[PDB]
């Protein structure tokens, strides 16, 4: 028999790009029913907007539907490369970008379960049962995937994946009914009841397969190198600029510039831009709204960051967001300064909570100035960097189908921005109906049956080439940011456990994310 | 149907080589989990190095990982030939060496087990379940196999084999934490967490197969003949050598040599070499170290032996090592002088605990000499033999990937030495996930399932040809070293059991190993 | 480590327990007795190499 | 140059940067002016402390 | 000076060479030879690695 | 040029000084062959300003 | 060489903006080493020497 079926994962580099590809069994649920169960909590707050806790923020009511279809995600720059890997990439290529990729459902299980004579449970292989499978492609069935999931690709090999379940958020009617002062979300004309089942998709008995793929349209790449030189630090290190401004109005000289100095002057040729708040840690986080209780957070413009140390102090300019808080084997809802983003060059280029003088607004000799860390609107002639990457990482997300959309190149979270990405890949099990109970009793139920597929994604990134430098100095290195004696991506015994910060270490992420631009050139 | 599937074992000789090949069902485990379970006992001693028992030797702490992957071994010159066979070979060919070989997984079982209604257990054939299978080839995933296993090839037909489970010994961090004076092994940068699952391998539903093979690079062969003549015994049996040394310094004659005698003289043309300890039996065994408690044994340089009778007395020069202690149906951890190596010609060529005069070190007429059985460094112009073979036998082992490596031709244990040998052949079962319990209860468990494969190895050895001799005298014979009335490789009834040394005899190895060089030529 | 390839979790061939004539043959401790673990070779060529004294 | 061996090492494996003494990075220039705050050094480019180790990477023999 | 070998990792600094018994009472009289460890047939090992700075090649006699 | 990296608050106790870091760069011209040039000799090179919007050179009478 | 860079068409000062422009054109003199002083005295100095080139740029504007 020719058909060689197999585990599918690894990745191979090549001077100009690389192929990433992984695998993880996965297990389609069973859900006895399925009805998309509609949705409309009718304001998760005190119905309206009073005041008492941390869920009573009620960002306007909301709609939803929970479809029997469990779809799947892998949207993590993660899983693909695998540190030994990732790393490699980081040291050798000055850039990455997704070419295209593919997904492949393999060894299908679709085995039903009929519990024992009361004694227990009996699970057998079942043909005739089939794992429905449908790929969006066309793009009907509202997106999702790109919005922070904390429920996707099992970061690691041999770790089943029981992929999310499709549910969306239509829009429309908002009734202030229930009490008299209580807002509830309802279904309107302009509402949408997307019904998966209506648009043939393929089935899939046991052993079968199916696949699909797409090409990430073009797209700027995330540079993977530093900037051993400051934007505001190119200039004639030892020479006098054009002509600076010395004092006031009418009768004010024009002090050219100090040879070897007066760096405050040094007319910069551009000027970093787009800063909106970005003030260190001093609910509700630099968020736009409508009624100061209809808000919605946001890790903010990728123009700015949200972490790093100016000097010993690892700021976190509010807003921010951490990728899983460094916990030692326990997922506790509350854990302070634990494994957030990392350390930008953005800083090096005027990017943390920094002042925006803008001086004179009609003062006495330029006295009344102002301090705007919250401001720094976009000025024509910008420049800057973005929240780099991390082995773990938002990888790419749907932009909305809205007119004009300035610099939508990247995901707030860090991934890639692009209307039309790796179309969702739903795959519910097919309700093999049938009587249940006794010989005389009936029961139009859903014969128990689930399926264990072994999905395999495969991506390709057009790695740019590492720039050239006259750097005599060996330039940085690799190893993922950690905390001495506590090396990430490995196993420490829970026995001769940590001598200090006690930890059983069953493999653990690093403290501060796997920084991207760990290398550097001199712009 | 053409496909003729079948039992695969036997071996056929041919003037210049032979094909060995065997089979043994085997049974892939089940291990409910799998996590490589990390490792670091933190010194198996009193944490440090005090004194109390026989495990408190703590050879420096150590690291490890126990991968869900059970690999497999057959590394025994044994199983291949089969005495009737082996024998044959021994009498007809003056040499053996591994050409190449092959492995073949056959009738795959991969049948899951679901226990009865409480009444018991139910095991059924299960497709959809698959015995993962991966062959190293490339050589990532640290070796092993060659290091004494006492857990490999079921020496005999109809004897299931439940092959070892992969676990390795990385290196790195050593913390003296726990108490204050307690050494523990930890994971370092220079440490390695080899994760099998990350590098596609092939699956394998029922009935399927898979195979692979390799060619033992070139390699000197283990001669299979004696030496009916002593190194130091070639010379003109009846004639006078050049000129010997009679007395002292300045005024000392030059007694040529006694016709027909003075054999002490007879200037030898070389001089056996490399002896390091090899003193008869007089923990801690001729082992190098660092802190007289960070040791590590070793059956020592193959230059020397470790058994034989100078005359009636079967020495064992400490160090040594026995291949399974002759027990009569019971494996007791403690059993004295029982079935060890065998009887070398090495002896015949100056090889057991023997003196190394080296005479004068500036004495009065060559009085102060010295006796070095422990010494006999390598001198330019050596010569010698190695620990021959045994039907049972270390067959070949990975040399380490370390620079320079003098005479790495053979395994300390006796097999063959060669960086890059029969790449490991891992084969864990694939975790067919799935709910367990009742209809209402869940349970993301590992549906029980194991697999019974019928592995078949096949080796080929370039048998050299038996040298030529003018020996009128029939020259030795065959039959495996035993103890009168107690013939190995056969069955004696436990009923009319042994009249003397009482033994049920359910087939038993011979006393002293199946000597190799049982035949002989006259170098 | 050279001396660290071996079956991390398994019993070697047969070690040497005590003295001469009447001396048993303690096989080897599963999971341990690393002092034994008959190495397959043995680093070599050392001539002095003693720390600054 | 031979080729770098292959490993199943999930763990990123070492790195590069030449053995030095914190704050005192070799193969570069530090000013003799705002000279060393501790071990005083004008730093007109200087080798590293302990030689540029070779086998800084690793496989698993 | 030089740097940090794996040689160590493979038994290479001032380390003991038991060689035990030389005809003692139950393996009592041993010995400690850091100075010794003659070449025995079946060696293995590593060498003083490299350094960006480094003896590069020299005439054998 | 102006590399970047280390910033030590040393000297007095409250005194900031710029220093060389990992992420620093010691560009050494001499290491990357270039051409010499005895007397009378010549040398040249050139490049093409990629595309680029032009600076209009006219007003806006409106 | 920084990610996103809105309307980088022109130099703050007025010129043209463009990653990758008329690559720098360095040209140091070559240190013709050699003893200096007297016949008996040494001196591993830089024999004095300078050079007068006549550079010629040439541009083209669409």
CSV table of N, CA, C and O in Angstrom, one decimal, chain G residues 6-54:
chain,number,residue,atom,x,y,z
G,6,UNK,N,4.5,57.2,7.7
G,6,UNK,CA,3.7,58.3,7.1
G,6,UNK,C,4.4,59.5,6.5
G,6,UNK,O,5.3,60.2,7.1
G,7,UNK,N,4.0,59.8,5.2
G,7,UNK,CA,4.5,60.9,4.4
G,7,UNK,C,6.0,61.3,4.5
G,7,UNK,O,6.3,62.5,4.5
G,8,UNK,N,6.9,60.3,4.5
G,8,UNK,CA,8.3,60.5,4.6
G,8,UNK,C,8.9,61.0,3.2
G,8,UNK,O,10.1,60.9,3.0
G,9,UNK,N,8.1,61.6,2.4
G,9,UNK,CA,8.5,62.1,1.1
G,9,UNK,C,9.6,63.1,1.2
G,9,UNK,O,10.5,63.2,0.3
G,10,UNK,N,9.6,64.0,2.2
G,10,UNK,CA,10.6,65.1,2.3
G,10,UNK,C,11.3,65.3,3.6
G,10,UNK,O,10.8,65.0,4.7
G,11,UNK,N,12.5,65.8,3.4
G,11,UNK,CA,13.4,66.1,4.6
G,11,UNK,C,12.8,67.3,5.4
G,11,UNK,O,12.4,68.3,4.8
G,12,UNK,N,12.8,67.1,6.7
G,12,UNK,CA,12.3,68.2,7.5
G,12,UNK,C,12.9,69.5,7.0
G,12,UNK,O,12.1,70.4,6.7
G,13,UNK,N,14.2,69.5,6.7
G,13,UNK,CA,14.8,70.7,6.2
G,13,UNK,C,14.4,71.2,4.8
G,13,UNK,O,14.6,72.3,4.4
G,14,UNK,N,13.7,70.3,4.1
G,14,UNK,CA,13.2,70.6,2.8
G,14,UNK,C,13.6,69.7,1.6
G,14,UNK,O,12.9,69.7,0.6
G,15,UNK,N,14.7,69.0,1.7
G,15,UNK,CA,15.2,68.1,0.7
G,15,UNK,C,14.3,66.9,0.4
G,15,UNK,O,13.1,67.0,0.7
G,16,UNK,N,14.9,65.8,-0.1
G,16,UNK,CA,14.1,64.6,-0.3
G,16,UNK,C,14.3,63.5,0.7
G,16,UNK,O,15.4,63.3,1.1
G,17,UNK,N,13.2,62.8,1.0
G,17,UNK,CA,13.2,61.8,1.9
G,17,UNK,C,13.3,60.4,1.2
G,17,UNK,O,12.5,60.2,0.3
G,18,UNK,N,14.2,59.6,1.6
G,18,UNK,CA,14.3,58.3,1.0
G,18,UNK,C,15.3,57.3,1.5
G,18,UNK,O,16.5,57.5,1.4
G,19,UNK,N,14.9,56.2,2.2
G,19,UNK,CA,15.8,55.3,2.8
G,19,UNK,C,16.6,54.9,1.5
G,19,UNK,O,16.0,54.6,0.5
G,20,UNK,N,17.9,55.0,1.7
G,20,UNK,CA,18.8,54.6,0.6
G,20,UNK,C,19.0,55.8,-0.4
G,20,UNK,O,18.3,55.9,-1.4
G,21,UNK,N,19.9,56.7,-0.2
G,21,UNK,CA,20.2,57.8,-1.0
G,21,UNK,C,21.7,57.7,-1.3
G,21,UNK,O,22.4,56.9,-0.8
G,22,UNK,N,22.2,58.7,-2.2
G,22,UNK,CA,23.6,58.8,-2.6
G,22,UNK,C,24.6,58.3,-1.6
G,22,UNK,O,25.5,59.1,-1.1
G,23,UNK,N,24.7,57.0,-1.4
G,23,UNK,CA,25.6,56.3,-0.4
G,23,UNK,C,26.8,57.2,-0.2
G,23,UNK,O,27.4,57.8,-1.1
G,24,UNK,N,27.2,57.3,1.1
G,24,UNK,CA,28.3,58.0,1.5
G,24,UNK,C,29.5,57.7,0.7
G,24,UNK,O,29.6,56.6,0.1
G,25,UNK,N,30.4,58.6,0.6
G,25,UNK,CA,31.6,58.4,-0.3
G,25,UNK,C,32.8,58.8,0.6
G,25,UNK,O,33.4,59.8,0.4
G,26,UNK,N,33.3,57.8,1.4
G,26,UNK,CA,34.4,58.1,2.2
G,26,UNK,C,35.7,58.1,1.4
G,26,UNK,O,35.7,57.6,0.3
G,27,UNK,N,36.7,58.7,2.0
G,27,UNK,CA,38.0,58.7,1.3
G,27,UNK,C,39.1,59.3,2.1
G,27,UNK,O,39.5,60.4,2.0
G,28,UNK,N,39.6,58.5,3.1
G,28,UNK,CA,40.7,58.8,3.9
G,28,UNK,C,42.0,58.7,3.2
G,28,UNK,O,42.1,58.1,2.1
G,29,UNK,N,43.1,59.2,3.7
G,29,UNK,CA,44.4,59.0,3.0
G,29,UNK,C,45.0,57.8,3.5
G,29,UNK,O,44.7,57.4,4.7
G,30,UNK,N,45.8,57.1,2.8
G,30,UNK,CA,46.4,55.9,3.3
G,30,UNK,C,47.7,56.2,4.0
G,30,UNK,O,48.7,56.7,3.5
G,31,UNK,N,47.8,55.9,5.3
G,31,UNK,CA,48.9,56.0,6.2
G,31,UNK,C,50.2,55.4,5.7
G,31,UNK,O,50.5,54.2,6.0
G,32,UNK,N,50.9,56.1,4.9
G,32,UNK,CA,52.2,55.6,4.4
G,32,UNK,C,53.2,55.7,5.5
G,32,UNK,O,53.9,56.7,5.7
G,33,UNK,N,53.2,54.6,6.4
G,33,UNK,CA,54.2,54.6,7.5
G,33,UNK,C,55.6,54.9,7.2
G,33,UNK,O,56.0,55.1,6.1
G,34,UNK,N,56.5,54.8,8.2
G,34,UNK,CA,57.9,55.1,8.0
G,34,UNK,C,58.7,55.9,9.0
G,34,UNK,O,58.3,57.0,9.4
G,35,UNK,N,59.9,55.4,9.3
G,35,UNK,CA,60.8,56.1,10.3
G,35,UNK,C,60.9,57.7,10.0
G,35,UNK,O,60.9,58.1,8.8
G,36,UNK,N,61.1,58.4,11.1
G,36,UNK,CA,61.2,59.9,11.0
G,36,UNK,C,62.1,60.5,12.1
G,36,UNK,O,62.1,60.0,13.3
G,37,UNK,N,63.0,61.5,11.8
G,37,UNK,CA,63.9,62.0,12.7
G,37,UNK,C,65.3,62.2,12.2
G,37,UNK,O,65.6,63.2,11.4
G,38,UNK,N,66.2,61.3,12.6
G,38,UNK,CA,67.6,61.4,12.2
G,38,UNK,C,68.0,60.0,11.6
G,38,UNK,O,67.1,59.2,11.5
G,39,UNK,N,69.2,59.8,11.3
G,39,UNK,CA,69.7,58.6,10.7
G,39,UNK,C,69.8,57.5,11.7
G,39,UNK,O,69.5,56.3,11.4
G,40,UNK,N,70.1,57.8,13.0
G,40,UNK,CA,70.3,56.9,14.1
G,40,UNK,C,68.9,56.7,14.8
G,40,UNK,O,68.7,55.7,15.5
G,41,UNK,N,68.1,57.8,14.8
G,41,UNK,CA,66.8,57.7,15.5
G,41,UNK,C,65.7,57.1,14.6
G,41,UNK,O,65.8,57.2,13.3
G,42,UNK,N,64.7,56.5,15.2
G,42,UNK,CA,63.6,55.9,14.5
G,42,UNK,C,62.4,56.7,14.5
G,42,UNK,O,62.4,57.9,14.4
G,43,UNK,N,61.2,56.1,14.7
G,43,UNK,CA,60.0,56.8,14.7
G,43,UNK,C,58.9,56.2,13.8
G,43,UNK,O,58.8,56.6,12.6
G,44,UNK,N,58.1,55.3,14.3
G,44,UNK,CA,57.1,54.6,13.4
G,44,UNK,C,55.9,55.6,13.2
G,44,UNK,O,54.8,55.4,13.7
G,45,UNK,N,56.2,56.7,12.5
G,45,UNK,CA,55.2,57.7,12.2
G,45,UNK,C,54.5,57.6,10.9
G,45,UNK,O,54.8,56.7,10.1
G,46,UNK,N,53.7,58.6,10.6
G,46,UNK,CA,52.9,58.6,9.4
G,46,UNK,C,53.5,59.7,8.4
G,46,UNK,O,53.0,60.8,8.4
G,47,UNK,N,54.5,59.3,7.7
G,47,UNK,CA,55.1,60.2,6.7
G,47,UNK,C,54.0,61.2,6.3
G,47,UNK,O,52.9,60.8,6.0
G,48,UNK,N,54.3,62.5,6.4
G,48,UNK,CA,53.3,63.5,6.0
G,48,UNK,C,52.9,63.4,4.6
G,48,UNK,O,53.8,63.2,3.7
G,49,UNK,N,51.6,63.4,4.3
G,49,UNK,CA,51.1,63.3,2.9
G,49,UNK,C,49.6,63.6,2.9
G,49,UNK,O,48.9,63.1,3.7
G,50,UNK,N,49.2,64.4,1.9
G,50,UNK,CA,47.8,64.8,1.8
G,50,UNK,C,47.5,64.7,0.3
G,50,UNK,O,48.4,64.4,-0.5
G,51,UNK,N,46.2,64.8,0.0
G,51,UNK,CA,45.8,64.7,-1.4
G,51,UNK,C,44.8,65.7,-1.8
G,51,UNK,O,43.8,65.9,-1.1
G,52,UNK,N,44.9,66.3,-3.0
G,52,UNK,CA,44.0,67.3,-3.5
G,52,UNK,C,43.2,66.7,-4.7
G,52,UNK,O,43.8,66.6,-5.8
G,53,UNK,N,42.0,66.2,-4.4
G,53,UNK,CA,41.2,65.7,-5.5
G,53,UNK,C,40.3,66.7,-6.1
G,53,UNK,O,40.1,67.8,-5.4
G,54,UNK,N,39.8,66.5,-7.2
G,54,UNK,CA,38.9,67.4,-7.8
G,54,UNK,C,37.6,66.7,-8.0
G,54,UNK,O,37.4,66.1,-9.1
